[PDB]
Amino acid sequence: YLDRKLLTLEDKELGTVKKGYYQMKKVVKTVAVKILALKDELLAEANVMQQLDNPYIVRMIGICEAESWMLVMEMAELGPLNKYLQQNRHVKDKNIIELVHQVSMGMKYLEESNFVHRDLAARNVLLVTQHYAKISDFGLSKALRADENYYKAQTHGKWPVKWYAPECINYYKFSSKSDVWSFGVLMWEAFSYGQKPYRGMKGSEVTAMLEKGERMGCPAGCPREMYDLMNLCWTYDVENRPGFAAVELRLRNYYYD
Ligand SMILES: O=S1(=O)NCc2ccc(Nc3nccc(N(CCCO)c4cccc5[nH]ncc45)n3)cc21
Numbered sequence: 485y486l487d488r489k490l491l492t493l494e495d496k497e498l499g500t501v502k503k504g505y506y507q508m509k510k511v512v513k514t515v516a517v518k519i520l521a522l523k524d525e526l527l528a529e530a531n532v533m534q535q536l537d538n539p540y541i542v543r544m545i546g547i548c549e550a551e552s553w554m555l556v557m558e559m560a561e562l563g564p565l566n567k568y569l570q571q572n573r574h575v576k577d578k579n580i581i582e583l584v585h586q587v588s589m590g591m592k593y594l595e596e597s598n599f600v601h602r603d604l605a606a607r608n609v610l611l612v613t614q615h616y617a618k619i620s621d622f623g624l625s626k627a628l629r630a631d632e633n634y635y636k637a638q639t640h641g642k643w644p645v646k647w648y649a650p651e652c653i654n655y656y657k658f659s660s661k662s663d664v665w666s667f668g669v670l671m672w673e674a675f676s677y678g679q680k681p682y683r684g685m686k687g688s689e690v691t692a693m694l695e696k697g698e699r700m701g702c703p704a705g706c707p708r709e710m711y712d713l714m715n716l717c718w719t720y721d722v723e724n725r726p727g728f729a730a731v732e733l734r735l736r737n738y739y740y741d
Pocket of ligand 1: 498501516517518542555556557558559560561562563564610620621622
C-alpha cells in the first residue's frame with residue numbers, strides 16, 4: 485500500500501483518471517492514477533499487475549487508500565496507441581512494426597507467465613515515447629491455473645467481440661492463443677492508424693463473416709509480410725494458430741531484416 489502523503493495529483497483530468505507524482509526513495513515519479521462493482525475490477529487488475537515485471541507492460545506502483553480509492557501506475561506519457569496514430573499519420577511503417585514487436589515481446593512474457601490478457605487492443609497499448617510501447621489495462625486478465633491451458637468465461641461482462649477468437653465466442657475459452665488472435669486485430673488497427681476494426685458491423689455480423697473464412701483486408705501502405713502475419717494470427721482453428729514465441733520471432737526477423 486502507498487502513502488497518501490507521498491502522492492500529489494494534478495487537478496486537470498486525464499470513474500476518473502488523473503496524472504500525478506509519487507516520491508520514491510529520492511526521485512519523484514510521474515504516475516497515472518485511476519480514482520474510484522467497479523472496485524473488484526480494479527482489484528483484479530492490481531492483483532495481476534503486482535505479479536508482472538516486464539519492460540513492455542505498464543508497471544504498477546501500488547494502491548493508495550485515502551479520501552478516495554486509487555490505483556497508481558508509472559505514467560506512459562503519450563497515451564493510447566489508437567489515439568496517438570489517429571493524430572499522427574506520418575508515423576512510418578518501420579516505426580509501427582517496432583511498436584507492434586514490442587507488444588509481442590510483452591505478450592510472449594505474459595504467455596510464459598501463464599496469464600491471459602483478454603482485452604488486447606490498440607486502445608490498451610500505451611506509448612512511453614513514439615518508439616516505446618507498453619501493454620496496459622489488465623481488468624479482464626486472468627492467471628491460468630497450473631493444470632489448465634485456458635480460462636473458461638462464466639459471468640457475462642465486457643465482451644469486446646471484434647478482438648475475440650472464435651473459440652472465445654463459441655466455447656468461452658480464453659488462452660494465450662486467443663490473445664494471439666486479438667494481437668492480429670491490434671496489428672490491423674496500428675497499420676490502419678487507429679481506425680476501428682470491422683467498422684459498421686455488429687458483433688454477430690463479425691462472427692458470421694469470420695466463419696465464412698473472410699478477413700479484414702490489408703491496410704493501405706501495410707507491408708504484405710505484416711498483413712500475412714495478421715492472417716496467421718487469425719487462424720480459425722486455435723490448435724493450428726501460433727503462440728507468442730512464433731509471433732514474436734517473425735516480427736523480430738522482419739523488423740531486423
Ligand atoms: O487516460 S488516458 O487515456 N487520457 C490521455 C492519456 C495520456 C496518458 C496516459 N498514460 C497512462 N499511463 C499509464 C497508466 C495509465 N492509466 C490510465 C488509463 C485509462 O484507463 C492507468 C491507470 C491505472 C491502471 C491502469 N491500467 N492500465 C492503464 C492504467 N495511463 C493515459 C491517458
